[PDB]
Structure formats: structure tokens, C-alpha cells
Amino acid sequence: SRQLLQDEMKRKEKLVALGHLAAGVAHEIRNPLSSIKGLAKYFAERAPAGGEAHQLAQVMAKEADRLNRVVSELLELVKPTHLALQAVDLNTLINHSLQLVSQDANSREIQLRFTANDTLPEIQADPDRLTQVLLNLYLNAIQAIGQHGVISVTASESGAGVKISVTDSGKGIAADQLDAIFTPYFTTKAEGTGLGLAVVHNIVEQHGGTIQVASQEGKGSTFTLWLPVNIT
Amino acid sequence: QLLQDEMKRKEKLVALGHLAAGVAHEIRNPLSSIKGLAKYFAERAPAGGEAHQLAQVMAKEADRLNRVVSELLELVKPTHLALQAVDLNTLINHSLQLVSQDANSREIQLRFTANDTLPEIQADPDRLTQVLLNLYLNAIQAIGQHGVISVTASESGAGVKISVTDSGKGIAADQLDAIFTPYFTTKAEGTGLGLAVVHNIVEQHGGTIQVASQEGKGSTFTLWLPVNI
Numbered sequence: 001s002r003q004l005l006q007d008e009m010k011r012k013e014k015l016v017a018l019g020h021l022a023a024g025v026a027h028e029i030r031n032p033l034s035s036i037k038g039l040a041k042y043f044a045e046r047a048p049a050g051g052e053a054h055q056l057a058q059v060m061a062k063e064a065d066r067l068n069r070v071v072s073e074l075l076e077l078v079k080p081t082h083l084a085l086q087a088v089d090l091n092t093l094i095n096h097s098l099q100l101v102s103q104d105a106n107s108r109e110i111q112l113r114f115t116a117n118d119t120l121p122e123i124q125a126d127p128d129r130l131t132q133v134l135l136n137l138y139l140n141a142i143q144a145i146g147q148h149g150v151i152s153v154t155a156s157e158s159g160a161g162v163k164i165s166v167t168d169s170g171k172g173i174a175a176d177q178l179d180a181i182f183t184p185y186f187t188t189k190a191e192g193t194g195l196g197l198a199v200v201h202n203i204v205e206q207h208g209g210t211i212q213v214a215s216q217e218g219k220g221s222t223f224t225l226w227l228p229v230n231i232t
Numbered sequence: 233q234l235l236q237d238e239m240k241r242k243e244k245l246v247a248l249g250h251l252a253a254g255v256a257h258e259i260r261n262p263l264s265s266i267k268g269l270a271k272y273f274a275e276r277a278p279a280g281g282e283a284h285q286l287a288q289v290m291a292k293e294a295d296r297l298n299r300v301v302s303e304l305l306e307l308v309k310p311t312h313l314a315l316q317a318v319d320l321n322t323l324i325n326h327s328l329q330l331v332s333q334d335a336n337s338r339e340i341q342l343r344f345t346a347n348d349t350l351p352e353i354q355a356d357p358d359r360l361t362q363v364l365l366n367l368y369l370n371a372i373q374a375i376g377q378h379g380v381i382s383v384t385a386s387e388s389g390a391g392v393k394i395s396v397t398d399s400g401k402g403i404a405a406d407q408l409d410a411i412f413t414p415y416f417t418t419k420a421e422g423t424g425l426g427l428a429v430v431h432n433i434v435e436q437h438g439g440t441i442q443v444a445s446q447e448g449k450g451s452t453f454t455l456w457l458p459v460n461i
């Protein structure tokens with residue numbers, strides 16, 4: 001028995017270690033990309049405007065920024081699961097996230113809607129990762145509405161856990177794309193990282209919850225989150 | 233359930249491979265164009281100036297990013313096969329036995345007939361067992377209760393064919409290749425990595441996997457593996 005546990009512990013250790021080394025390699029990819037992004041901006045600025053050199057240098061800079069954001073999200077995904085659990089009231093966390101996105105919503109003329117239920121029970125979760133998830137969903141919704149929209153967030157008690165649903169009024173998603181939407185590296189945006197919903201899924205998986213989506217193209221979309229009241 | 237954990241770890245390694253190949257593609261298409269732009273700016277700029285040196289620096293940086301992405305890919309590259317002689321009858325039986333209790337409780341019938349004349353192939357038993365377990369679990373999920381699971385093994389050419397047929401719930405034909413793509417799944421819970429592991433192991437061995445499915449009727453998955461790699 002002593003050796004068998006030593007064994008299972010060793011296989012688990014090998015997977016987490018591979019994750020740690022992968023995070024390091026990703027951090028080292030960020031360094032030449034950041035160098036490339038800076039040097040491509042210099043060349044774009046110094047190059048004669050309007051020409052092919054200027055266009056190519058600016059496109060390459062934009063691509064290097066997109067690549068740094070892709071690599072940061074990849075690091076978030078490859079990193080071993082590390083959750084700082086805490087008892088959190090969801091109303092306060094949701095309000096804080098909404099206040100975090102308020103300026104960008106008002107700039108684009110998008111309404112933030114959320115009603116709080118003080119009856120709502122506290123959940124065992126990592127508040128920073130839940131923020132990173134809510135913000136990713138909010139950003140997706142904002143990009144999709146583009147202007148003149150509304151975001152409705154609600155929280156309710158489902159069995160044991162809670163369901164936070166974020167509904168937008170944007171372009172929606174076709175049923176054909178309704179499955180590749182969570183697939184890594186898939187995006188319909190030229191300045192998009194197709195890893196935001198991958199990160200959302202990973203974080204909600206580490207929390208033992210579920211992410212589901214219901215969308216009608218043009219009408220809008222709704223992302224529903226189930227998070228357990230007790231992590232165990 | 234320590235088996236379930238080992239399965240999950242294999243799924244995570246396959247996922248890391250996919251993520252790495254994706255970042256590599258996304259990083260590599262621009263790289264060549266950046267290196268050319270660097271070369272044009274450097275030839276245009278006077279020798280020794282700041283634009284010249286910085287252009288060489290940008291080129292070297294693109295080459296270094298290629299080296300680092302190659303490193304990530306090599307790190308997630310799967311270990312070579314532990315090639316050993318395997319009697320597939322014994323393996324299929326052990327695989328079904330690892331599923332015996334869950335199939336029994338969920339009212340699932342396990343049917344296999346062994347051919348004594350079936351040759352023993354050079355393969356990795358643990359990985360083949362992983363492909364079999366993945367196919368079986370997917371099949372049980374396809375039908376919670378009142379189903380039958382049929383496995384057949386046969387010689388074919390210079391190889392062997394194993395077919396897993398289930399009553400299940402069926403998969404439409406409009407989504408056939410996409411079933412093998414990693415992170416692809418038709419259930420709310422669950423990863424989309426099982427058949428990704430299956431395909432990775434089969435292609436590692438040197439064989440092929442094919443699917444047949446009638447909606448509402450059931451699904452058949454066929455594996456061809458070589459006798460000597």
C-alpha cells in the first residue's frame with residue numbers, strides 16, 4: 001500500500017510538473033513576441049506612410065499584440081489547477097464586475113441590468129477567477145452588441161448551487177457554430193483570442209460547475225453558469 | 233476509480249498537445265512575414281544605423297520564437313509506444329471486466345466471442361485498453377439503460393480489426409469527422425477528448441479508426457491495428 005500511493009502520487013506529480021514547465025515555456029514565448037511587437041511599432045513609425053512597409057509593420061504589430069494575449073490565456077489554461085477558495089457573496093462580486101465594465105458599456109451605450117437577492121447563499125469559490133469569467137462573458141457580449149444594447153445578469157438558487165445567467169442582445173450564434181464556440185483558438189474576430197471561453201470553461205470546471213449557452217441569431221444569447229454551494 | 237484518474241490525465245496531455253499545436257500555428261504564420269519585413273527594412277536602411285541593427289534583432293527574435301514554440305511542442309510530444317506482444321482476446325476481456333459492474337448496474341449487456349486463431353500483435357496494452365475503455369464509456373453514455381455492447385475481433389490483411397457496436401442513441405452523419413476533433417462533444421458535462429485519445433493512440437500504433445452510426449439505432453466504431461509495426 002505505501003508504495004502504491006507513492007506511485008499514484010508520482011503520476012499526478014508528473015502531470016502537474018509538465019504543466020509547470022509548459023507555463024514557463026509560454027512565458028519565454030511572451031518575451032520575443034513583446035520584442036517583436038515593440039520593434040514592429042518602431043519600424044511602422046519610421047517607415048514612409050501609406051506604403052507596403054508601413055501597412056505590413058502595423059499589421060504585424062497588431063498580430064504580435066493578439067499573440068501576446070493568446071499566449072497569456074494559454075498560460076492560464078496550461079497552469080496546474082490552483083484555486084484560492086473563499087466564502088463569497090455573489091451579489092457583491094457581480095456588482096464589482098459590472099462596475100468594472102461600466103465605463104466601456106456606457107461608452108458603447110449598453111445597459112447593465114442586475115437585481116440582488118440578499119437571500120442568495122454564499123458560495124465556496126475563488127473570487128478572482130470568477131471575476132475573470134464574468135468579465136470574459138461581459139466582454140464577449142459587449143463586442144457582439146457593438147452599440148445600443150443591454151446586458152442582463154441574474155443569480156438564482158438551483159438545487160444546491162447557484163445559476164448566474166448573463167444574457168446579451170447581440171448578433172447571436174448560429175447553431176452550426178453553437179458547438180465550436182467553446183473550442184480553443186476559435187474566433188470570428190480579427191483581433192480575437194479564441195481562448196476566452198476556453199478559460200471560462202476551465203475555471204468553471206475547476207469549480208465543479210457547468211457552462212451552457214442558448215442563442216437565437218440576431219435575437220441574442222444567454223450564458224448560464226452553475227456553481228456549487230459547496231465545492232465538495 | 234484510480235483508473236478514471238489515469239484516463240483524465242491522458243485526456244489532459246492530449247489537450248495540452250492540441251493547445252500547443254494551435255499556438256504554434258498562430259505564431260508561425262506571421263513569423264515568416266516578420267522575418268521578411270525585417271530583411272527588407274535592413275537592406276533599405278544604411279549599414280550600421282539603428283534601423284539596421286534593430287532589423288537584425290527582429291529577425292533573430294522571430295527565429296528565437298520559433299525555437300521556443302518548437303520547445304513547447306517537444307515538451308508535450310507523447311512518449312513512444314511500449315511495444316510488446318499482446319493477445320487481444322485477453323485484453324478485450326479485461327477491458328470489458330473493467331466495465332462489468334457499471335454495465336451491470338446500468339442494465340448493459342457485454343457480449344464478446346474470442347477467436348483462438350487471432351494472432352498476437354506488437355502493441356502497447358495499456359494504451360489499447362485506454363482506447364477500448366473510452367469507446368465503451370462513450371457507448372454506455374449513448375444509452376443509460378436497456379442496451380447491448382458488442383465487440384468483435386478478426387484478422388484482416390496484415391492486421392486485426394476490432395469493432396465496438398452499441399445500441400446507444402446514435403450520431404447523425406452530418407457530423408462524422410468532427411467527432412474525432414479534440415474538445416468536440418454533444419453533452420453538456422464532459423470533455424471532448426476521449427476520441428481524441430483514441431485517435432492519438434491508434435495513429436501512434438499505425439492503424440486506422442472508422443465510425444458507422446444510425447440515429448436512434450446505435451453506433452459501430454472499427455479499429456484496424458498492424459500485427460508487426
Ligand SMILES: Nc1ncnc2c1ncn2[C@@H]1O[C@H](COP(=O)(O)OP(=O)(O)O)[C@@H](O)[C@H]1O
Pocket residue numbers: 136140141144168170171172173181182186187188189191192193194195196197198221
Ligand atoms: N455573447 C456572445 N454573443 C455572440 N457570439 C459569442 C458570444 N460569446 C461568444 N461568442 C462566440 O464565441 C467565439 C469564441 O469566443 P472566445 O473564445 O471568448 O474568444 P473571442 O472573444 O476572442 O472570440 C466568438 O468568436 C463568438 O463567435
Ligand SMILES: Nc1ncnc2c1ncn2[C@@H]1O[C@H](COP(=O)(O)OP(=O)(O)O)[C@@H](O)[C@H]1O
Pocket residue numbers: 366370371374398400401402403411416417418419421422423424425426427428451
Ligand atoms: N458511441 C457513441 N454514441 C453516441 N454518442 C457518442 C458516441 N461516441 C461519442 N459520442 C458523442 O460524441 C462526444 C465526443 O466523445 P468524447 O470526445 O469522448 O467526449 P466525452 O468525454 O464527453 O465522452 C461524446 O461526448 C458524445 O456526446
Ligand SMILES: [Mg+2]
Pocket residue numbers: 136139140195196197
Ligand atoms: Mg472572448
Ligand SMILES: [Mg+2]
Pocket residue numbers: 366369370425426427
Ligand atoms: Mg468520452
